[PDB]
Amino acid sequence: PTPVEEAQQKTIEAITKAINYMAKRRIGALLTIERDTGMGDYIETGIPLNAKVSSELLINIFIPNTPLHDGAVIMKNNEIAAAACYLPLSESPFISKELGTRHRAAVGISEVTDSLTIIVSEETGGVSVAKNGDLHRELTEEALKEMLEAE
């Protein structure tokens, strides 16, 4: 495998381990992965980190009642670019009415970028992904990892 491919696999493993940990504990999370549409405008609304990814940092970021836990984490490749970022809120009628701001923000950014956003519900622990204006809910650990590997 090339170094880029191995680095990508490490990042996926870090993300999936963090998301799985948060889902089990009902830790709300909002994690947007930049793709080909640049997200600089939104990255600049948060606290800059420019940090190497780890499952441990991702978890620490979203612990409730902490400085960094509200708003989105935005990733660029293997790095956490910024935390506590603003994303636009979708007005889509296909967002389940019981869902809160994190899900509406994820769908919102997915309507104006090709990014992939992962959401952990603080109510249920359910894991969802927003992509291209669609929200896919109640993902298994395997489905999430397969979505990341495919993207």
Ligand X SMILES: O=C(NC[C@@H]1CCCO1)NC1CCCC1
Nearest approach, Cβ of residue 12 and ligand X (Å): 5
Closer Cβ to a copy of itself, 64 or 133, answer by number: 64
Lay out the site mask for ligand TBJ across 47-86 (x = CB under 6 A, - = otherwise).
----------------------------x-xx--------
Q: H-type helices in the chain, by residue range?
A: 3-25, 40-43, 55-62, 101-110, 141-150
The answer to the question of residue 124 lying near a copy of itself (CB under 8 A) is no
Query: Would you state the structure tokens that stand for residue 101, as one six-digit string?
Result: 């701001």
Residues contacting residue 114 through CB under 8 Å, at least 6 positions apart:
35, 36, 37, 131, 132
The answer to the question of residue 32 lying near ligand X (CB under 6 A) is no
The answer to the question of residue 148 lying near ligand TBJ (CB under 6 A) is yes
Kindly report the number of other CB atoms within 10 A of residue 65's CB atom. 6
Which residue among 50, 60, 77, 124 contacts ligand X (CB under 6 A)?
77
Only segment of 2-10, 45-53, 104-112, 135-143 that touches a copy of itself (CB under 8 A): 45-53
Give, in order, the Cα–Cα distances in Å from 81 to each of 43, 71, 93, 96, 110: 7, 13, 31, 29, 18
Site for a copy of itself in 57-76 (CB under 8 A): 57, 59-61, 63, 66-69
Q: How many residues bind a copy of itself (CB under 8 A)?
A: 21
Inter-residue contact 27 to 20 (CB < 8 Å): no
Whose tokens are 């880029």? That residue is 4
User: In sequence order, what E strands does 44-148 have?
Assistant: 47-52, 72-76, 79-85, 116-120, 127-131, 134-136
Contact footprint for ligand X (CB under 6 A): 4, 7-8, 11-12, 33, 75, 77-78, 148
Positions touching ligand TBJ (CB under 6 A) are 4, 7-8, 11-12, 33, 75, 77-78, 148
